Amino acid sequence: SNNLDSKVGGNYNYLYRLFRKSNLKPFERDISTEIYQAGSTPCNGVKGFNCYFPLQSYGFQPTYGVGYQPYRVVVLSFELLHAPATVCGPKKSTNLV
Amino acid sequence: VFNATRFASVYAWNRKRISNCVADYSVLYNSASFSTFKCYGVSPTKLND
Amino acid sequence: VFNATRFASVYAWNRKRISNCVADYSVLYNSASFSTFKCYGVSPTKLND
Amino acid sequence: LCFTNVYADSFVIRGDEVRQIAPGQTGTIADYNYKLPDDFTGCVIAWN
Amino acid sequence: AISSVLNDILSRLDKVEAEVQIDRLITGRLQSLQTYVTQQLIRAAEIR
Amino acid sequence: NIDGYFKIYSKHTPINLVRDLPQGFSALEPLVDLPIGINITRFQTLLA
Numbered sequence: 452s453n454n455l456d457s458k459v460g461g462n463y464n465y466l467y468r469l470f471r472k473s474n475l476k477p478f479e480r481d482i483s484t485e486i487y488q489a490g491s492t493p494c495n496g497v498k499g500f501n502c503y504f505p506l507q508s509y510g511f512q513p514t515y516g517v518g519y520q521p522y523r524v525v526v527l528s529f530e531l532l533h534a535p536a537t538v539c540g541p542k543k544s545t546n547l548v
Numbered sequence: 549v550f551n552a553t554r555f556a557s558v559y560a561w562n563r564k565r566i567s568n569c570v571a572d573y574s575v576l577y578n579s580a581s582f583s584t585f586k587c588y589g590v591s592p593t594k595l596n597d
Numbered sequence: 598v599f600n601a602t603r604f605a606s607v608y609a610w611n612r613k614r615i616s617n618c619v620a621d622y623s624v625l626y627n628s629a630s631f632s633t634f635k636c637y638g639v640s641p642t643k644l645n646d
Numbered sequence: 647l648c649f650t651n652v653y654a655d656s657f658v659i660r661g662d663e664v665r666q667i668a669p670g671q672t673g674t675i676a677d678y679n680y681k682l683p684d685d686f687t688g689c690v691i692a693w694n
Numbered sequence: 695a696i697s698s699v700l701n702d703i704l705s706r707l708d709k710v711e712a713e714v715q716i717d718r719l720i721t722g723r724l725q726s727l728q729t730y731v732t733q734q735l736i737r738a739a740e741i742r
Numbered sequence: 743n744i745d746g747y748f749k750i751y752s753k754h755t756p757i758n759l760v761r762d763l764p765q766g767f768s769a770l771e772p773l774v775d776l777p778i779g780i781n782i783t784r785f786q787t788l789l790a
């Protein structure tokens with residue numbers, strides 16, 4: 452999506468997460484900014500030695516190479532053939548006999 | 549879902565719910581704009597069926 | 598390496614090889630002596646394992 | 647090796663659609679266009 | 695395989711992404727017959 | 743709550759009992775399923 456999302460300074464509004472107590476479960480969301488404790492030390496406040504902000508951004512710029520460039524993603528997830536259907540593809544029904 | 553002006557950030561990945569509607573997945577599958585379209589429990593051709 | 602008396606000029610940067618030994622980072626990533634440590638294709642936490 | 651009956655099929659396409667040449671596919675080249683037999687024995691050679 | 699129901703494989707996958715599943719069902723099912731027919735032969739000796 | 747779907751099942755039966763939970767058997771029907779996606783750690787009721 453480089454021509455849609457990229458900017459020659461870096462579109463810094465996109466954040467990923469670098470740290471986590473544990474690998475999150477399938478389809479889990481985690482809204483947090485609480486500082487990651489890389490040292491054995493406890494670490495309060497906004498920053499600290501070996502105390503890392505748990506997010507970092509992408510700098511998205513058109514001047515980068517392929518692979519660096521921003522990708523949009525959609526994951527279409529669905530469940531099938533086991534419950535009352537609420538979505539269908541464009542097949543018309545026939546009569547019933 | 550595919551032309552919306554800003555997407556969300558991954559750490560706060562948006563979820564939209566879909567129901568009570570008709571789904572022409574040939575729209576998604578045919579467009580060259582998409583680099584990858586990998587399906588993990590259906591063939592992409594079968595989505596319309 | 599980190600504690601060397603003298604370091605090289607970057608125009609002639611030293612390229613030293615390391616082997617036959619154990620890579621213990623505990624007195625390293627966990628240590629106050631550096632105002633930056635960034636890894637780029639591993640988690641620094643994993644450098645022991 | 648040796649080969650019974652050998653046929654070279656020649657054409658030009660957009661490179662995005664090279665993947666449609668794979669033996670069982672369904673983009674417009676593979677559809678209305680040049681369709682491989684599913685048990686296709688042979689090679690595909692492509693260049694910019 | 696993705697299911698026990700053969701039609702829920704066939705009505706979801708194409709002719710070749712299905713094979714990788716259907717061959718598993720053919721394999722396991724056929725071993726289920728070979729096991730039954732072995733037990734029935736060994737049993738047929740007891741009754742004989 | 744399963745994978746973001748909160749589900750309610752319920753039953754109402756008549757009874758005639760003075761004090762404890764009535765010994766016997768019956769099953770709850772599924773009443774509703776809602777896509778709520780929230781975390782639920784804990785809960786409370788609502789009197790009137």
Ligand SMILES: *[C@@H]1O[C@H](CO)[C@@H](O)[C@H](O)[C@H]1NC(C)=O
Nearest residue numbers: 599600624625628629630631
């Ligand atoms: C360097 O070595 C000294 C001991 O010779 C040690 O006290 C110090 O922590 C070391 N520093 C680093 C950055 O490894």
Ligand SMILES: *[C@@H]1O[C@H](CO)[C@@H](O)[C@H](O)[C@H]1NC(C)=O
Nearest residue numbers: 476479480780781782783784
């Ligand atoms: C939801 O968060 C609460 C409070 O932190 C926690 O006790 C519970 O384990 C969490 N459950 C899930 C699945 O996130």
